[PDB]
């Protein structure tokens, strides 16, 4: 069956600074909360860290070569805040900016549109020492940072993302303690969520004031959940899942207010966002697009007990196949999420800023990586992406997650999400079968599956 | 995650006369349309036929042993019409009835509840020579047949199914020409559908009049389809899918009228059911349960062109994993179908009379059949079955399709659906891993997946 | 493509006394030229002999069981002359006749038609000591032998073959010295050819006089050859190939004279058949059928040099695939041979008395013999057999060579021609995949290939 | 057996522009009907296209190196019409001509004789927009094209072929709709067949007028068929097979008239070639040779029903071994075809312009491709080629199909016909075992098989 895609569809791939760059202690780069976290014994699996990663800092040419070989039209990457402003504010490290300029220049020179992500969890340790995202001071620092990048790369980059996966940097980091800084405080997580949103709003305003042409948005990893039973309590239990991960950030931006149902939920628990008068108006700035980061979804039901958790929404195994990282495959969730976002936010421009599977396939004696499982996963989701477009949703692009295997945060290097296999011991890069497959999909513009 | 099942849940397994029995030309058994079809060159793959099959006719003890080893509480099987009435009517072949009595006695002796299926596509050739289901004469023959079985086994059997998968015996057989008799006439298929329904209604009436205690119903293989786009035309295109395969038979029974939308669809094409005055009232007889036969579902969209077919409903590949027979795995469709049936028909008693996967796994040098794929499939669907029960649907039982590998109709013996591996050359039966797995599920009454 | 076969087509399989029986020195059996030959160092590969073979002499029940499992309608076997008449003449060994009666009775009891072959190369050593087939005395001995068998088994057997593969027992044995007795004399080979024909004629006459109902014929292994070039000399070179192996025996029977072209060829070399006045008339007796033994054919060209040989007909490799015994696969040769025989001899009743492939496939760890190569070979030839029938040729039956692996004469036990695998060390018989395949072909009566 | 070949035998290999070149959108190359076809969803398997192919456009040196390593004396390639005349007529793209000049120069520099093929299905889309070969305008365009190439490369190339496989570009493309343009109209296919023949005749005339020394011919893929039964109707059914694919084109050229039997066949169906007065005389121009393209042949029989098709000639499976693309191996058909052509057309100069097998063998861990099946196939056919020469047929050369694996039209890249393995993902070329084998055959000039 032929799954068609628009002629002007933006095919791309994405990466993240700390996950691929390496050279963490070079050319005046300051430490980030992740350098600290990774260096802390017991925080990352096997004691892995992004010290070297894929060494992309010294392999701009190699990165771009993979990109032009893939035939990608858009490349999404992030800027390492500590690399341009080691202290988060003040002294500008030109050596860092030089790298990003060199990268962007190569991209442009090869017809690849840069999709820059300002913040991808690598907060400068200096700012963290001052309270990190828990302090409003960091909001100022981010505004300074954003303005700097807008002035530096704003003339070459016309695709900007303020924060990538707000829930992960806020709740998974400050509430669940799985990601840097590694705190376990619900209120703090809510504080961080509020401060990042204000920082975002201010960044959007600056983008507009600077008159720099292009688009700017935010990329939430809106968690999806399907109602176990057709009950009001189950549907609401599922609404809270996408509510505390996506709606919590998109609503203040689009409507100038946090989602009511979530506010009431937190309020009943004794939690409220530290809203300083004027904040909501700062956050309430029109953005050009929403970045959808999808990987999986669950089947939830209302449960007031421990099984339901803070959201009293218990997930129930569908018995579905899982990726090597343990996530269930529910391709239909992509369509459901896109449909939801399109309905609620007035069908704005949507870009799948992240979508991929974790499959640890290595090299066969063949010399190649036969990751059919990744191909199958991607194919299923691209079918849902095409479905959404056919269903009138404004999906303007798709960027599969991870160009190459990288530092998978707390999981270390064990989990592989890339199209290009990276042997971390020899740093040798070998394009997987999925690479060549995706290349063909991009070339054709359609899928015969 | 623990998927619970009611204490009184009827766990079972099913088979079909011509698919396992064998001894087609023994003890006075008359030929059926399938004996003829299978014997016709080019009709069945490799020229396979149910002459011997699994030889269950001579292995009653072996069959029952597998059943008690599995721990099954219910066993669904069918009666070979030509074996009890070689000419479809008149002379009663007691040798045939003896077999069924011996089987039923063994079942009862081992605490296994018989779930008898009167008609499973094996129409006596003698009746086919007179026009088969295209002639109203066959309706009389079936009424005679039903009455005979009700009087013979009615005292031991309290679970009766008139027709199994009406759409298959009607449309796939007389419209698509894939199954016996192998005709290609839409109107004829509609005629057959009407006549089988009248025969069903008359059989239900007889069941009531004979005062035989128990339950009686019909088992449709209601094809499921998911709307590609959230469009009225797509939703209607999907409604026609379940409409011409399930609603077309259940509506005349529950409401005393064919589904309006289907009537109009056929009418516009110049097709109408041969309704003789009084027929609808004969069909409109209350049944005790609905037998749900589920295996897969599709994703359809409206299409007036050839791609849409007669129903102008084009199926679009989900890119989902498929069984060895080529059917996509869409476990959620089970829940959707059960939910649909429960809503429309007043939440009647439901029994999943068929559900399984076609996986051709053979014996490993291990000596066992490691069919994890079948286990995974079953597990996923049982999770949906439990979901339905949790969602208030009256699902009272589950019977996985095929106790052992058998004659898969037009596919011959190549496609394996059973829990027990059957080597057709040596007729040796070896329980697969799925057998032992299902056994455990039945024993526990729940599933930890 | 469906290759149909007549409803009354005689499906069968064949064996040979010395190749399967065993018990060479039991129940008063006399030695044959093959017992002597095989016992002679250097005559048979590895020093193998038919002392035990498949031990079919003690396994009548097992033989017949394989036959009824195969679904064969006709079974062709041969009578061990030394087993019924140890000295070739005189004293009758009733113990031997008892075996054949027991075998025939079992066959008849299971609906298997016996196809008896009087002579299959096992000439009694006693007669060989008197000159063997080189002496006219043996003609008398054979007449006595034939009469004995006709009187003994004539009431149960209605299918008789006097001599099997005359060329092999004559030329390959007395001219090439590869088979028993192992002589190298062209004239002697011609003498033997003449004497066996007279013995045949006399046997046919006796068959008629005894009034025993049934059929009687001879089974030549008419070697086929295709003209390399469309030249008269090449066509004649090819005619001599089928001429000295088949025409040389069939012509005296059908026309009462040896083929002219062959007579002239031998005459020019100084060779002539020892025709005693009256002989040709004795040989010129009407037979009921011709037994065609086909396996392969070649591509020949005229060559007066050594490469052409005695017949000045040099074979040229077609580069075609070969069986494990080294014979090229030329299925079309079957049709060509049948067509030739049908044209020349007035389209008489034809029976493919031998056709199979030598494939040494053994048991896999599977426990089965996956001899797809044998299946493919048989299929190709059965397609040609069906072709011949469609082309109006009177082919009334097919008997694939070797029911089970046996003593392959000079090749010993190394070459396997059977449908049933025989482990010569343990004497265990295991039906190969070809067995089950052929069984299906016989059952259907057609072939979907 | 030694199969000898003449000392002056022209050993070669062949390729096709769109199948290997790549760089479809470079140096001003215009689109062809195949670029369009391949780019159309659902037209080519997996959505493959000749965009890159083997990238031979940028690898002239590599191509020639393989050629000199193979020891080939002749290299047959085709000119991409859209590459020299992007619009089919008018503006000459010198960049395209430069490539062909560079290739030809390298060939000549290494002692390799160029065998140029003007048309190999890649008709300029511009001409197709005007009706393509259905319009007589294209005849003019081809005449202009031919004249251009004759003037450009005529001084270096002395071996010219106007059209390659006329039946494929005509019937398979415009009647069966399997190849570009993809039409289904018998009359249109007949129109195209007529127009290409006129274009051919005009091209031959130009070749003569320009006084350019050398040879010029046409290469039909005359389909061969063997009579199932020795019946007149079957023989005629087989004559139509080679008649509508080869005789239909060769007769107007050699005799100045379409084959009578074919004319009558089409006429009875209501079809006639659009013969404009003077056309037959234009086509009736003496050619220097006939290019025989052989791969397989069938066994046909007369059949007025659907099974017989338009030609009422039903093919019957020989059960013979097949190549990986599904074609039966019938080596003898080569000899039969050559013999037929030699008899009918006055034994003109013949060149096997195409002959090879589709075997998808890839690299073993050995690092080499052990394609013994291709070697066996080639060997068998070369034996028939030698046979033809020995039989007095004027076979002056052999060119095995595909130097390297390439874009197999509608089959995409999945089917491999080359002597050199091409990994389409890495574009790495690895000589297969067949390469080294063929090299040896060319070196020796004979074959010991």
Curated annotation (Swiss-Prot), chains A, B, C, D:
Xref: SUPFAM superfamilies: (Trans)glycosidases
Keyword Electron transport: no
Alphabetically ordered keywords of this record: Carbohydrate metabolism, Cellulose degradation, Glycosidase, Hydrolase, Polysaccharide degradation
Broad enzyme group: hydrolase
BP term (GO), one: cellulose catabolic process
Active site, per annotation: 165, 354
Catalytic activity: Hydrolysis of terminal, non-reducing beta-D-glucosyl residues with release of beta-D-glucose
Domain of life: Bacteria
E.C. number: 3.2.1.21
Coiled coil: none
GO molecular function: beta-glucosidase activity
NCBIfam families xref list: BGL
Entry similarity comment: Belongs to the glycosyl hydrolase 1 family.
Protein name: Beta-glucosidase
Organism of provenance: Niallia circulans
Designated gene of the protein: bglA
């Amino acid at each position: 069956s032929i799954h068609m895609f628009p002629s002007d569809f933006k095919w791309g791939v994405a990466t993240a600074a700390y996950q691929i760059e390496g050279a963490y202690n070079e050319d005046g780069r300051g430490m980030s909360i992740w350098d600290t976290f990774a260096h802390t014994p017991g925080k990352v699996k096997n004691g892995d860290n992004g010290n070297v990663a894929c060494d992309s800092y010294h392999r701009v040419e190699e990165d771009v070569q993979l990109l032009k070989d893939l035939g990608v039209k858009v490349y999404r990457f992030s800027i390492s805040w500590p690399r341009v402003l080691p202290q988060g504010t003040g002294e500008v490290n030109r050596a860092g900016l030089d790298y990003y300029h060199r990268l962007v220049d190569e991209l442009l020179a090869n017809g690849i549109e840069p999709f820059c992500t300002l913040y991808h969890w690598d907060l400068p340790q200096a700012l963290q020492d001052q309270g990190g995202w828990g302090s409003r001071i960091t909001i100022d620092a981010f505004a300074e940072y954003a303005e700097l990048m807008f002035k530096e790369l704003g003339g070459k980059i016309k695709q900007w993302i303020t924060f990538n996966e707000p829930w992960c940097m806020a709740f998974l980091s400050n509430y669940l303690g799985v990601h840097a800084p590694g705190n376990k405080d619900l209120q703090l997580a809510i504080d961080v969520s509020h401060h990042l949103l204000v920082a975002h709003g201010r960044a959007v305003t600056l983008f507009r004031e600077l008159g720099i042409s292009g688009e700017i948005g935010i990329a939430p990893n809106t968690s999806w959940a399907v109602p176990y039973r057709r009950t009001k309590e189950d549907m609401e239990a599922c609404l809270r899942v996408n509510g505390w991960s996506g709606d919590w950030y998109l609503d203040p931006i689009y409507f100038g207010e946090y989602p009511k149902f979530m506010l009431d939920w937190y309020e009943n628990l004794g939690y409220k966002p530290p809203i300083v008068d004027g904040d909501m108006e700062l956050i309430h700035q029109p953005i050009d697009f929403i970045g959808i980061n999808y990987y999986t979804s669950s089947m939830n039901r209302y449960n007031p007990g421990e099984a339901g958790g803070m959201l009293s929404s218990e997930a129930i195994s569908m018995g579905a196949p899982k990726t090597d990282i343990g996530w269930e495959i529910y391709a239909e969730g992509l369509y459901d999420l896109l449909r939801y976002t399109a309905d609620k936010y007035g069908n704005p421009t949507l870009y799948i800023t992240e979508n991929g599977a974790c499959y640890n396939d290595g090299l066969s004696l063949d010399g190649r990586i036969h990751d059919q499982r990744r191909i199958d996963y991607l194919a299923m989701h691209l079918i849902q992406a095409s479905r959404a477009i056919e269903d009138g949703i404004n999906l303007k692009g798709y960027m599969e997650w991870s160009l190459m295997d990288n530092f998978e945060w707390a999981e270390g290097y064990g989990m592989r999400f890339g199209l290009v296999h990276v042997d971390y011991d020899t740093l040798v890069r070998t394009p997987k079968d999925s690479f060549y497959w995706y290349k063909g999909v991009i070339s054709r513009g359609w899928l015969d599956l």
